[PDB]
Design an enzyme around this catalytic site. Structure first.
Site, PDB file in Angstrom:
ATOM      1  N   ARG A   1      -5.948  17.628  -6.611  1.00  0.00           N
ATOM      2  CA  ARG A   1      -6.945  16.950  -5.779  1.00  0.00           C
ATOM      3  C   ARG A   1      -6.771  17.068  -4.266  1.00  0.00           C
ATOM      4  NH1 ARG A   1     -11.591  13.594  -5.053  1.00  0.00           N
ATOM      5  NH2 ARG A   1     -11.829  13.120  -7.289  1.00  0.00           N
ATOM      6  N   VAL A   2      -5.590  16.724  -3.768  1.00  0.00           N
ATOM      7  CA  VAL A   2      -5.311  16.790  -2.345  1.00  0.00           C
ATOM      8  C   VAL A   2      -5.479  18.210  -1.787  1.00  0.00           C
ATOM      9  CG1 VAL A   2      -2.865  17.382  -2.012  1.00  0.00           C
ATOM     10  CG2 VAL A   2      -3.906  15.443  -0.751  1.00  0.00           C
TER      11      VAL A   2
END
Ligand SMILES: Nc1ncnc2c1ncn2[C@@H]1O[C@H](COP(=O)(O)OP(=O)(O)OP(=O)(O)O)[C@@H](O)[C@H]1O
Ligand SMILES: Nc1ncnc2c1ncn2[C@@H]1O[C@H](COP(=O)(O)OP(=O)(O)OP(=O)(O)O)[C@@H](O)[C@H]1O
Ligand SMILES: Nc1ncnc2c1ncn2[C@@H]1O[C@H](COP(=O)(O)OP(=O)(O)OP(=O)(O)O)[C@@H](O)[C@H]1O
Ligand SMILES: Nc1ncnc2c1ncn2[C@@H]1O[C@H](COP(=O)(O)OP(=O)(O)O)[C@@H](O)[C@H]1O
Ligand SMILES: Nc1ncnc2c1ncn2[C@@H]1O[C@H](COP(=O)(O)OP(=O)(O)O)[C@@H](O)[C@H]1O
Ligand SMILES: [Mg+2]
Ligand SMILES: [Mg+2]
Ligand SMILES: [Mg+2]
Lengths: 340, 477, 124, 340, 317, 170
Positions: A203-204
């Protein structure tokens, strides 16, 4: 159940070994292992185990073990959160493992129902969100103007047969950034850790993966994403794209290396040694199986006659044009290392 | 010591409603968990206090029939939890959910009695030492291993394993084992409870004459209210304990269903003034299966090689009953009803039977590898059996057709019928502590030996029998 | 109740397919014993989809028997895959639908249960 | 619904005919037929029907028929239990049929809800167990030192479409020893009584089945257990184990005999006549269908010219080496009894 | 089905039958209730002039509260009774949905101060469908050849509504929506339509045998239609391919359109009290006659029509 | 969702165009378009649209649009029913479109729960029947002896993925 959620968290914490006495103080990590539910002997399996590698020397562990009335099993995560916050508010950093928020899920609804606060979905008191949001929302990145500290938090969750979208999991995956899925369904096949690409993400973004992985791993995960199709299709392929075999071949071979599993972490410059060799299709074609022999030996081979290469990572901080040539000259030899 | 204040510890029953009897004390309010004594009785009616409702009134969970109870009956306050006679002077004998002798051979003359509600072993009481203990049962021993002070647990609905495997383990274990043995039957049949007694007589284990009894029988079952099925498993546990602690021995403990400690809540929660939950249950199931199960564990004074059994309501593992319990069993065995059809017995399934003692350091690198490989082949096997080929094998891909010979034979090798099933067909109760597990099974997966006419190797495990059966049922000309 | 029907079909497909799976190899046995001497140097010097690739290419006991003898296996191979490939992929459906049954088995049980108390617990 | 649960119980009770006036008083049986829910005319179909075979002469029947407020439909089983207990406490024995505990299930939750006792699962008052445990637990075997009496109890249960594991059924199958499953799904096919081997058992083991069945039936049930596979596999078999056909052949032929169905019970020594012939593969090969002609005629054939054989059962109490020879000499004749 | 079949039975029954007739419409449409009136006028049954009326009309429906739909079925029952008892006659009684006696509870229970249950229902549904249905029965004074109808909420037989009622119906007919697609009408399904009067002593040994054999072939048929062959018939095993001709034709022979469906296509309202059911249907299962071009025998039952249709739709050259 | 339930009802109403000024007065039709739930701009898409074909000239439209507290979304159908009843009681006839009884379904359970009337199935107050029966039962055919008028009513319903047998739809 029994998929590896704690070995992973026990290896992720164990890895901080070298740094908790090394040079770069900023390149360190203090851990706060929390346990919610667990039998107090499973916890003593860890305290002692960690103690064996001296890990316990640079870690704080806390328990909300079964005996403990539901509230203890409820206040515990919010306790360890305040443990690391010392570090996330003092330059220092921490790795907190919230062992079983779901077990706290089972243990939360109790305290309220008894308080007679109208139940909602599957007993969970309405604020089941504010329960696992309010928390995670505390493990945040700190800016230099505020500290530069940090607190990384991996909340552990119980998957019931494979469903990751259950109330509580939705609740918890609708917040956290990055969810490593561990599948019992795979495990025994040798496919351990067993992470379901597609139903999981970092995600990041590429931010975490240093120039090293952005040089190698950049292909790895998404290679497998759509591959979920061809891997589940090649088993019945015939008059199709002849050469397509390549994209499938990059899976089987790679698999035997991607399956990490042991009571020992491989430093990032070592990860750069073996896995990197794969993305740069060199091993490939060779009949697999013996690949594990590589990921084990290659290392001994490294520290035995290749201590420089890794250092280039500690100098430049990426795979060198020179070092690529060298590692190339080492993995190529392994093709015929078991080839007559 | 059990003695109240210089004021009445007598309470007059103010409300009886099924398994719940509210009581009201005017000069001596009796604590949560205290075992109480119904006066005016024609027997023994202990009501365990449960809540402190106010208006100087407790709320007890009745230990036996509440029949004929009367609004005004005097309830006696003892001053301590239901405390059973714990000691050697209770082995061989049979005790009910209070310490009353149920096997009928009279008083249990004992030096003292332990409370059934005790603080569990703390964290610095624990012991990491996980020393192996062989059961000599394919899956149950090799696949998902056991261990000293470990925790067994079987998962099947109504009749697939559990009681049978508890008797099985009793065979391969209970009979030969140093130290003692205990069997707390919770909820389950009174029939089995009787036979088990008599079988324990016919085989010496329970000797009514000499004093050569290693087991103890604590019972609390079905024909009873929930307040007794709730604590029975506790007593059969208050029993294994004193043998380990105050008499430093490596006991074992058979609980015919430990989650019967939960049905008790499913029957007393809401009627205690609680708000329901998962399927109805209780805002407690957790701490319950918790607080109790956190007792049958080892320590720096002794070990308890316990054994339990957990039911599967509505055939749903998805029930927070077999589930919540998982996190307690140092070995898993979810027996499939969908397996029973296939005959595969015990019905231990190739996925949902984990462990916390299956590392190459204790179980083996070779063995754990073939186990992994057994399940590996078994996984794509579970898919292939339907996916791709669509039921009918043959098709193509001998790679998986190999699975149709390997995995299939594997299922068979693991389908150990054993002694306990002697009543259906008097079949070869296969077992044997590992011994010749080497070579035999290893062969299959690699391809060695594997090929003999499929079902020709069904009701037998040891590969030697493949050719030793080929004669029984042959094929050629 | 619902998935049962969906689970019935699969189980119904098993019997026929899964059994023929064994026959898939059986046909082979009843062929080689006599075919061999005639092959190599002995002379010279669903239903899968094998019985198709040859026919679409149109855009006296000698060849007619020798070819058929080798083609017999080529054709029967349809069953092999039909009872293997068509079962391996299909069987996965059993475990899926089954685990899904236990999902809406629990669900209903924990759905209607809500209603029962939705009224019961709140009154006076 | 409509599967045969009452015909079976009406034949199991009807069979006690001969003994309720025969010699061996211990070889008798009193019945307590309970009805829970049923329309009072379905009950009058039975009272009269039984009366037709004089069965009613040695039976007690009781009703909790629809009109009756839920409590009657609740107290009834616990009433008939106390009927037989006279016998289970007086040497004598009894066969009690609890007709529809599930219908009492539907009829129990009522009484409590109205009492405002917090409902649990599908309304059932929490003690749904103690409801059908507490009861069955009364039909127990009696030791000579206590009486030698008995009380056998077959609780009847409503199967909804085929699910035997529903709450209440679990509740009731998690107690009782031995559950005969009756499947509507089969019925009309001719497969009556229609008992699902695998999802049913005698449980008590070979103890019940006298030396007779332990000599014959010992194979019967488990023959069919795994057979559930080959019976559902042979329909698509080909290049497999040629001779395997045997294990399947022992099913079809046997089927036409295993399908009992009529208003008349076949004494145990008669069961020994026909079914026994099957286990000892003699009829087998012959094209089935006419098998029923055997299981009907064989009997007339017996009482017409083979009254001795059965008596051997009343003398020795098993199939004789001699009698086997004789019965053999009678069934073999039937192979060619319709074979030109 | 339900209302339609109640009118159907009204045709094949209500019109010709000694004694009287009653129709208590519960819950259901007021439209049908009106037409039914007028149809009962157009056909004499209800005569406003003379006094030649055999039926009685007790109504309590939809536009009303639950306390009326609850008792209406009772009145139409308090009606059939007095005709049987005090006037010893063999009445009949048509209840357009008798379980409307239950929706009434689903609407008045909890609001009476009750604790809910199955889906919400009531701690009474049992005694309810009980106490009442235990009224429309015969006696040593007269008979009531009653007829009822029970709805299937959410298409779920699993609802304790059609279910709990089963144990009261001396004949079953669970019409499948999944059947309606197939056209098969009435939608009476080949498994869930039991009875307590189907023994060879009253219905017949031959007939009950073919019935058993119809459903027998039908069962492995339900499996084969999907299992093994996988949808597409043909394949192999003519044994079951036989089923694809037999069972299929069977479904058709049983799909009697009848008079009451005259408003959709004015089709041959097939019926006839047994008569030539012999030979015809028996043929199929044994193999006699069976073979004609499948759907060529769809919208008709009597085998005679197979050849009598072969001309309508032929095939050969 | 998005299947055409309103275009159809918007064309079925639009068709009455020619007759609402033609000859045969009996061969006419007045419409009462009711809206339950809908955003008040979706309703203004219709009022205006209909107005474009002049349809609005011979129609009455009413709204119980989201803002409106659940009761409005509840009383609305029973309001338009009384609109046409003028016509169904005066020779004249009407076409009433009850837009989203299901949306009234979502909007009914509210008013009661808050009244503390013990909920039943999926919240729906027990009389979920008497809610959509009691209504429809008003759009009836009228006999000459009573008027010859009429009121045709097409209740619009939300299909969730395809299931037509859900509680409320049943
Ligand atoms: N790296 C590994 N490779 C293969 N197997 C492993 C590895 N690490 C651990 N295992 C074993 O597999 C299981 C997984 O770890 P663990 O038991 O903690 O799993 P979990 O998902 O946390 O569940 P639980 O602790 O409740 O059993 C254990 O038996 C463990 O020792
Ligand atoms: N031995 C038999 N062989 C074939 N059919 C039978 C046999 N005995 C009974 N039948 C008939 O089959 C049906 C089964 O019996 P019965 O009706 O009592 O079944 P049940 O499962 O008890 O259900 P219910 O009584 O509610 O209808 C009846 O119509 C019955 O008369
Ligand atoms: N006759 C038509 N043919 C094809 N598409 C149409 C037709 N009429 C309308 N559409 C369009 O298809 C969709 C259906 O109409 P509408 O949007 O009102 O559907 P609905 O089922 O009422 O749902 P909702 O109004 O909530 O969106 C719209 O975008 C509409 O303009
Ligand atoms: N060892 C075994 N081998 C084969 N079948 C068994 C075995 N044990 C039990 N079964 C089957 O399971 C049925 C009952 O299950 P059981 O294990 O006895 O239930 P539980 O142990 O939960 O009381 C038996 O009557 C039989 O079909
Ligand atoms: N005899 C019949 N033949 C064919 N279809 C029918 C018949 N009766 C009803 N249907 C179908 O069923 C639809 C309505 O069902 P119906 O039986 O009239 O409902 P109910 O009787 O429950 O009021 C019809 O509009 C039509 O498609
Ligand atoms: Mg863990
Ligand atoms: Mg019956
Ligand atoms: Mg719209």
């Amino acid at each position: 159940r029994q998929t590896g959620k704690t070995s992973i968290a026990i290896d992720t914490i164990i890895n901080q070994k070298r740094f908790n006495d090394g040079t770069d103080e900023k390149k360190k990590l203090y851990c706060i292992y929390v346990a919610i539910g667990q039998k107090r002997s499973t916890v003593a399996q860890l305290v002692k185990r960690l103690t064996d590698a001296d890990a316990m020397k640079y870690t704080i562990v806390v328990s909300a073990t079964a005996s403990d009335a539901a509230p203890l099993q409820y206040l515990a995560p919010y306790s360890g959160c305040s443990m690391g916050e010392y570090f996330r508010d003092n330059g220092k950093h921490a790795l907190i493992i919230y062992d079983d928020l779901s077990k706290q899920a089972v243990a939360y609804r109790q305290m309220s129902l008894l308080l007679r606060r109208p139940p909602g979905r599957e007993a969970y008191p309405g604020d089941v969100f504010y329960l696992h949001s309010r928390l995670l929302e505390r493990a945040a990145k700190m800016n230099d103007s505020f500290g530069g500290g940090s607190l990384t938090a991996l909340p552990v969750i119980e998957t019931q047969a494979g469903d990751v979208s259950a109330y509580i999991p939705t609740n918890v995956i609708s917040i956290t950034d990055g969810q490593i899925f561990l599948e019992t369904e795979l495990f025994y096949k040798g496919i351990r850790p067993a992470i379901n690409v597609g139903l999981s993400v970092s995600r990041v973004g590429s931010a975490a993966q240093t120039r090293a992985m952005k040089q190698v791993a950049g292909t790895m995960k998404l290679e497998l994403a759509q591959y979920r199709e061809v891997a589940a299709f090649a088993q019945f392929g015939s008059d199709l794209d002849a050469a397509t075999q390549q994209l499938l071949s990059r899976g089987v071979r790679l698999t035997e290396l991607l399956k990490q599993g042991q009571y020992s972490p491989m430093a990032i410059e070592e990860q750069v040694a073996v896995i990197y060799a794969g993305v740069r299709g060199y091993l490939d074609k060779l009949e697999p199986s013996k690949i594990t022999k590589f990921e084990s030996a290659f290392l001994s081979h490294v520290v035995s006659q290749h201590q420089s290469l890794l250092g280039n990572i500690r100098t430049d901080g990426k795979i060198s044009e020179q070092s690529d040539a060298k590692l190339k000259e080492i993995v190529t030899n392994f093709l015929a290392g078991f080839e007559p | 010591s059990a003695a109240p204040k210089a004021g009445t510890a007598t309470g007059q029953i103010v409300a009886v409603i099924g398994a719940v009897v509210d009581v009201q004390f005017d000069e001596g309010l009796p604590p949560i968990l205290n075992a109480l004594e119904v006066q005016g009785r024609e027997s023994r009616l202990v009501l365990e206090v449960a809540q402190h409702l106010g208006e100087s009134t407790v709320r007890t969970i009745a230990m036996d029939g509440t029949e004929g109870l009367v609004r005004g009956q005097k309830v006696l306050d003892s001053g301590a939890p239901i405390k059973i006679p714990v000691g050697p002077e209770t082995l061989g004998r049979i005790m009910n959910v209070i310490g009353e002798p149920i096997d009928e051979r009279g008083p249990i003359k004992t030096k003292q009695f332990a409370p059934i509600h005790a603080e569990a072993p703390e964290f610095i009481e624990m012991s990491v030492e996980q020393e192996i203990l062989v059961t000599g049962i394919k899956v149950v021993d090799l696949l998902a291993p056991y261990a000293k002070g470990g925790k067994i647990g079987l998962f099947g609905g109504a009749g697939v394993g559990k009681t049978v495997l508890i008797m099985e383990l009793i065979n391969n274990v209970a009979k030969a084992h140093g130290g003692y043995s205990v069997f707390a039957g919770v909820g389950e049949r009174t029939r089995e409870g009787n036979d088990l007694y008599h079988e324990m007589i016919e085989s010496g284990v329970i000797n009514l004459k000499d004093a050569t009894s290693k087991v103890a029988l604590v019972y609390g079952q079905m024909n009873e209210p929930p307040g007794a099925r709730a604590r029975v498993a506790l007593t059969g546990l208050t029993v294994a304990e004193y043998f380990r602690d105050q008499e430093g021995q490596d006991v074992l403990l058979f609980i015919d269903n430990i989650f019967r400690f939960t049905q008790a809540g499913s029957e007393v929660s809401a009627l205690l003034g609680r708000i329901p939950s998962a399927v109805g249950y209780q805002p407690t199931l957790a701490t319950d299966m918790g607080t109790m199960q956190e007792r049958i564990t080892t320590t720096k004074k002794g070990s308890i090689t316990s054994v339990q059994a957990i039911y599967v309501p509505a055939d749903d593992l998805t029930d927070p009953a077999p589930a919540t319990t998982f996190a307690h069993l140092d070995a898993t065995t979810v027996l499939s009803r969908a397996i029973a059809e296939l005959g595969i017995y015990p019905a231990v399934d190739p996925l949902d039977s984990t462990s916390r003692i299956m590392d190459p350091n204790i179980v083996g690198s070779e063995h754990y590898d073939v186990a992994r490989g057994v399940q590996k082949i078994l996984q794509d096997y579970k898919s292939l059996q339907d996916i791709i080929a669509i039921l009918g094998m043959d098709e193509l891909s001998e790679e998986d057709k190999l699975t149709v010979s390997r995995a299939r034979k594997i299922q068979r090798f693991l389908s150990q019928p054993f002694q306990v099933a002697e009543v259906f067909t008097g079949h070869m109760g296969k077992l044997v502590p590992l011994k010749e597990t080497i070579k035999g099974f290893q062969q299959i997966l690699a391809g060695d030996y594997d090929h003999l006419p499929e079902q020709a190797f069904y009701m037998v495990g040891p590969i030697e029998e493949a050719v030793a059966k080929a004669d029984k049922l042959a094929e050629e000309h | 109740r619902d998935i049962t029907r969906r689970l019935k079909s699969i189980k119904n497909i098993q019997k026929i397919t899964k059994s023929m799976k064994m026959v898939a190899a059986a046909k082979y046995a009843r062929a080689e014993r006599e075919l061999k001497p005639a092959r190599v140097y002995g002379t010279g010097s669903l239903c899968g989809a094998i019985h198709s690739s040859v026919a679409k290419q149109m855009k006296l006991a000698n060849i007619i028997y020798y070819s058929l003898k080798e083609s017999t296996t080529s054709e029967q191979s349809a069953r092999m895959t039909a009872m293997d490939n068509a079962s391996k992929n299909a069987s996965d459906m059993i475990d899926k639908l089954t685990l899904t049954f236990n999902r809406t088995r629990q669900a209903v049980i924990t759905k209607e249960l809500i209603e029962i108390i939705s009224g019961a617990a709140a009154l006076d």
